[PDB]
Design a protein around this ligand. Structure first.
Ligand code: MG
Length: 282
């Protein structure tokens, strides 16, 4: 009876095809107990009124622990033109309006973590600074709505790109964006959900990051190229050893689109089975 989390985006639209209640029961039957949401918007999760989704998840024996959300300008219908990527002093009020409404909803959902998973546009040290200030202020807004954990941040690999000046410009030149995020976000306000796969895809070591910043990395995404253990990438034994040494209490399984024609439900099962059989996973 291991406790295992799932980032539901792993299932894509398979979660919403047919009988959603039965699909959530299948999630439980595969060995998952904890959910991180994706697809929240305007009081709904993947189009399902959020409290109805919560009830179906809970009736299946699942608990909603976390949610992935990205700031959007609700004046825009097109959900791609609505995504706020270019941070500025001017758009900050709109960003804070998003966080207030979203955090209020997630407090009603009883969600422990509220996490931004996509990087804003960052090409310079100054842009990174402003993004950090915005994250710090977002945390204040989120806590005021009742989510004590504040602002969480999930990375891909773009955060390991370096910002280097012209005079600054294999050799390392300039600072990695992620290092600037750690440095210039307030540890009492902002924490990190480290995606171990995308860290490796950014040429960095998630174990080293956990050792260096045990105070900042509080949640993990456990992810491989596809099904856990089938690639030459990822040392999950060391990743879990380090996770436990650090006292990290929450992780979520993630699976991107299967490359081999299989369904997401099939691959998600195989990921659970890997963890269930792994002696290093408690
Ligand atoms: Mg991830």
């Amino acid at each position: 009876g291991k406790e295992i989390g799932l980032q539901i985006y792993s299932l894509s639209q398979e979660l919403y095809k047919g009988d959603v209640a039965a699909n959530l029961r299948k999630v439980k039957d595969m060995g998952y107990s904890k959910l991180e949401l994706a697809g929240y918007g305007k009081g709904a999760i993947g189009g399902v009124p959020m409290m109805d989704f919560k009830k179906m998840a809970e009736d299946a024996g699942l608990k909603i622990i976390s949610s992935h959300v990205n700031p959007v300008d609700t004046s825009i219908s097109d959900p791609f033109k609505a995504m706020i990527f270019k941070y500025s002093k001017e758009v900050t009020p709109k960003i804070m309006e998003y966080w207030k409404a979203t955090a209020a909803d997630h407090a009603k959902l009883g969600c422990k973590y509220l996490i931004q998973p996509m990087m804003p546009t960052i090409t310079t040290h100054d842009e990174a600074k402003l993004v950090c200030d915005i994250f710090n202020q977002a945390s204040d807004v989120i806590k005021a709505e009742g989510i004590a954990t504040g602002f969480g941040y999930h990375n891909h690999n773009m955060e390991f790109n370096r910002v280097a000046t012209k005079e600054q410009q294999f050799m390392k030149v300039g600072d990695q964006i992620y290092d600037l995020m750690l440095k210039d976000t307030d540890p009492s306000k902002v924490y990190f959900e480290m995606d171990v796969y995308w860290t490796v895809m950014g040429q960095n070591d998630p174990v080293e990051y956990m050792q260096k910043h045990p105070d900042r990395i509080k949640v993990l995404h456990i992810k491989d190229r596809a099904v856990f253990g089938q690639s030459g990438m990822m040392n999950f034994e060391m990743i879990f050893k380090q996770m436990y040494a650090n006292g990290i209490k929450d992780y979520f399984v993630e699976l991107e689109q299967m490359p081999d024609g299989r369904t997401q439900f099939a691959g998600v099962k195989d990921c659970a089975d890997y963890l269930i059989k792994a002696p290093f996973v408690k």
